[PDB]
């Protein structure tokens, strides 16, 4: 039987431990080692220090063990049983939130392991591939001055993007400033392009979100992502009845339970689990099933490294409705270079890899360079 | 204009990191330091390494800061605004679970500070005390042999306990054993005593749960605690339609959002937030209001140190319906001795402290002896 | 301990006791006296004679005591416990309506007392301030002839108001007269200004309200306040499904219970408790929490004296979503001059006061002048 | 063309203003005077000072007039239009609570006038009498010692009471005492008697309430009255799903709106409007219709003077299901002697009066003796 022999956690960071940090300038990656010398790689988009503690923690009580402790000596191929072992065994400190992000990383690595052991791409183990490539949308953080975004938008257009998302930075702060940035990007993109917006909850309330949506209705937005916090399922529901554009959310949620509540109560058009936060590939499978039962489109969230990319691609290839992925752009060495043989965006699409497991080879020299721990 | 100058996390432990650990043999306490020399003390009943990481974490992104970074230089008196700053600022890594445990500890410390600063017990800041002492119930892990339990029951009877709870260990596993443990405890306690069971999710399904509910209807139990996992709200509701006894749960939940769902969808009679997990005193207050609006009894959960105890007593004293508290006991030096002037169980009841803040003086010798960090 | 020693009720009136009276030409204010010589000031926007009787009443039965009787000798700092004491103790004559207005006045004065005793502004005790000033909207009673409102609107525009509300007088009487007044104010204000209307229930029925709303839809009204009586929650709900503009109501309601029913059943966009009617600052806190849970915007109602103003400002400063206040305009000496150091509207905003308690000094000479009792 | 010329409020009292007072030692009665010499009598079971203020109040605003000002010069026969004029005209200070108590008194007086004017008993104006007498139940405050109660039960048995209610005093406080009081009363009355309890909200929560419901299932109580406060409709509904006995409440509510909510959301078996609080005879009629539509039994609440008694009998006589009335007794001269020709309890029953109006002649000597104003 294939036995787990070690779990290795690697904190990677680009700026200083006291300095500021954007999305994608740090990472936490896990290597699961087995007795046959198959290593699986996963990651979590979460706080690296916290994820590390969830994995490396000792026993606190019978329902509170660090994840490494529960998994050394275990049968790596039995992925779902191990998911349930980690979930129960770390339940006191996990169950929702950071502990589930830790589980996601390990689960992803276990799927990598199984694919390599069995000699098949993960998409085969998930049921088989429906497509040889996946359509992407590109994302950017918008420039403070509205008309300075034309250069960014045009830069994505000749890259081949037929769909774009923007938000963060100073997005949501001024109704007039919000209007002027959305103006300058639709004009720069033309009337064929899909344009969607992400507020990262910055419109705060239901009323401010609805007023802003009718004013931006002329620009024909494809969706409006996280106008408010996903805590208020009532606020989402109420926005759905009163807005014309699609509503998207869900990226910060963890486990099938939170997704089941979101999907059925928010009346969102689009649900966006992150494969490295939600519980991993195993959990994402169950979340997809719930979405399908409810007529909700699942478009995964994610921007970290090639590990998230390879996991998300393998997952979507295996979905009948896996027709759209987020492909975010960064100059960070962690995004561009950590995975040596990284899948590349190419004229509107990313190709599906058929290599065993997740098809990940890590840049070992780069690990040595940015290793905090 | 009291400013926060430092947040000091103390990991305490009795056995070694590689060794076995039960409820109460480790703790994570937080000291919040101000520029006027007053210190506030809080704790989190969770994994000490994870809570430490939540507090000490650097910036990862705009919604992902460790708590300490968000709080140095802030006005300590502005407790609810600071709760929201932490909730928002750590949202990506927190929101539910481990991050909220870390928030709970700090929140508790901030209340302790405000009390000292204002020269009044926390119960006055919470609205004023309804009682001079609080009725307690006692808890035990039952011995494997059913006939061995008569000495533990009697031991609690000698202390003055009019109400007792048992669970954990071999409770839950075998239905015949379960019956044999419940047999010996009602007989040893007599018909006078309130007797409650806590299965810690070990009956697994409502089908297995409902069978024992008709079986032990002759033993007249006060409540049945966590028959299944609180993840299945439907399983709880279904139990409430066919069970004679009262249903209790909720100890592992975090934020008013999880409690609002549990309270309204589970039809449980009793909700059990832990003050050191749910979000702290600030959040506990909101959870109390929701419980009141829905006719649900709030009996807090908690067993760690005198910190949890002092916070729970100050809370319940200020609640119109704050009429019952868990008083679990251990010989563990972290429970008995960390808080110097610790409130004592006394013939059925724990007295309400009127000292300013939470009335907590820490055994500084003991801290040095048992600190891991 | 800080003990209540007296409760002093002052009926102030501008015109004769047999003459007509507009909004703001009479007031009832309460002074709560303590043994440390701290006086707290509150008021109720209600009938002065009735409020006075609720406070000064003797015992009628065990659940029917005047409020003064329940509070002399009590511990003033224990505000929420005293709220519950008054609520239970006056339940037979109070519970809803005028008795709750009486409670509001006292509760406001108790918060004033606590702030002074502790040496902090009330906004600190409510959780801390989110903003140094609060955006206001101005209100006026419209002139009978439509085009005579231009002078009023322009008068508010150079005052700095970016948002205006009008109603009362002859508002709601004629569909053509209603249309012509709304015409002449939007033209006078321009297309940038927020313009909202208040009918004070004068459209009577659901059908008349809906027909009038589509005809005024061109003028882009920010909200429609109280089209019908808030008794018919069904009428509000039905209007929400069929109207484009925001629906506001709630000003006449009392206690969390009426607000919970309104908020959840009316599907109103905006809920408007009056801090001097709803149960006071204590109750308003619980009403805010309910609004937040349901995605409903809370915009306080109020126009009486500086006492209501100072209470509402302290409250909103302490709300994460306290972004808008009603600032009504009157020439009445009670509005302009009763509070000596009154906060002033200044170019679109009112500044937040940091003085201890509510920051209220009463014009004692003015009290002597208009004192009926 | 009968015109109202005066409304005369009479505050009556037995002990002094500073002294103790129980149910029935004060009253507030209203005389409505017409220009044709006929006088109508009503009362309000509420605080006499507050009801007086509600009636005698000046104008405060357009929706805030004292009732007397709204009614002088009006056509007394137009009772329902006058109810609506008062409801609307005092809405700001009334709407629920004390203002509706003041309306109730006047409404009752107007019915008394119409009856005299038309030469027919009020029961004819209400639709016509179904019965010549009404079955009564009797009430007592139980003596502290459980064994002392056997003489009171027997005392009521001697009078002819086939149905009895007890509560107040020390009822509610201690569960063992509660059981010991209920023990002695079923035994003293025998199995024949209908026995009911009224806790006056003193069981506080449904958890405490439901335990006694299984406990006293052997005593076969006719109903359990107001176990908790009627504010928590959810608490009532939850009690109805698990209680053997019938649930009663509603005595403190005002207007068809509160009753509609209580009746439909509480799942109570019995609703108890007080004719002198709920809105008067006019409103009671509407509340009866709602109760009928929902299968809810209406048993009126009331203990004050012969005014309440004469109004309640005239009401119930005209109801198809007006088959049970509360007949509480006191030695108090306001109860026994204010109404000269007072209807008498007679061997189980109170006879129906056919005199025009309410058949009320007031003891004018007694008025002079006990008037406060
Ligand atoms: Mg997003
Ligand atoms: Mg438990
Ligand atoms: Mg209004
Ligand atoms: Mg009663």
Automatic annotation (TrEMBL), chains A, B, C, D:
InterPro entries: DgoD-like, Enolase-like_C_sf, Enolase-like_N, Enolase_C-like, Mandel_Rmase/mucon_lact_enz_CS, Mandelate_racemase_C, Mandelate_racemase_N_dom. Keywords: Lyase, Metal-binding. Mg(2+) binds at residues 198, 225, 251. CDD domains: MR_like. One of its GO terms (biological process) is amino acid catabolic process. The keyword Lyase applies. This is Mandelate racemase/muconate lactonizing protein.
């Amino acid at each position: 039987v294939l036995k787990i022999t070690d779990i290795e956690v690697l904190h990677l960071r680009v700026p200083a431990m006291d300095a500021d940090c954007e999305w994608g300038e740090d990472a936490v990656i896990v290597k699961v080692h087995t007795d046959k010398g198959i290593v699986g790689v996963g990651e979590a988009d979460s706080s690296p220090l916290v994820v590390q503690a969830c994995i490396e923690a000792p026993q606190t009580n019978f329902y509170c063990n660090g994840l490494k402790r529960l998994l050394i000596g275990e049968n790596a191929l039995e992925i779902e049983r191990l998911w349930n072992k980690m979930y129960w065994g770390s339940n006191y400190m996990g169950r929702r939130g950071a502990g589930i992000h830790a589980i996601s990383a390990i689960d992803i690595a276990l799927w990598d392991i199984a694919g390599q052991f069995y000699g098949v791409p993960v998409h085969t183990l998930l049921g088989g591939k429906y497509r040889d490539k996946i359509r992407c949308y590109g994302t950017f953080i918008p420039a403070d001055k509205p008309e300075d975004n034309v250069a960014i938008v045009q830069g994505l257009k000749d890259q081949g993007f037929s769909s774009i998302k923007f938000g963060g930075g100073v997005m949501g702060d001024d109704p007039d400033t919000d209007y002027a940035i959305v103006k300058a990007v639709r004009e720069a993109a033309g009337p064929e392009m899909e344009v969607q917006i992400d507020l990262a909850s910055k419109w705060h309330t239901c009323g401010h979100s609805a007023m802003m949506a009718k004013r931006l209705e002329e620009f024909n937005l494809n969706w409006i992502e996280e106008p408010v916090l996903a805590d208020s399922l009532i606020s989402y529901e109420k926005l759905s009845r009163q807005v014309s554009q699609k509503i998207a959310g869900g990226e910060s949620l963890t486990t099938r339970y939170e997704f089941q509540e979101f999907i059925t109560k928010s009346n969102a058009d689009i649900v966006q689990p992150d494969i490295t936060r939600c519980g991993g590939i195993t959990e994402m499978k169950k979340i997809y099933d719930i979405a399908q039962m409810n007529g909700t489109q699942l478009i995964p969230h994610g921007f970290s490294t090639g590990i998230l990319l390879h996991a998300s691609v393998h997952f979507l290839a295996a979905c009948e409705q896996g027709t759209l992925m987020e492909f975010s752009q960064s100059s960070s060495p962690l995004f561009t270079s950590l995975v040596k043989n990284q899948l590349q965006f190419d004229n509107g699409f990313v190709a599906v890899s058929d290599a065993p497991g997740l098809g990940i080879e890590l840049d070992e020299e780069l690990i040595a360079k940015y290793r905090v721990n």
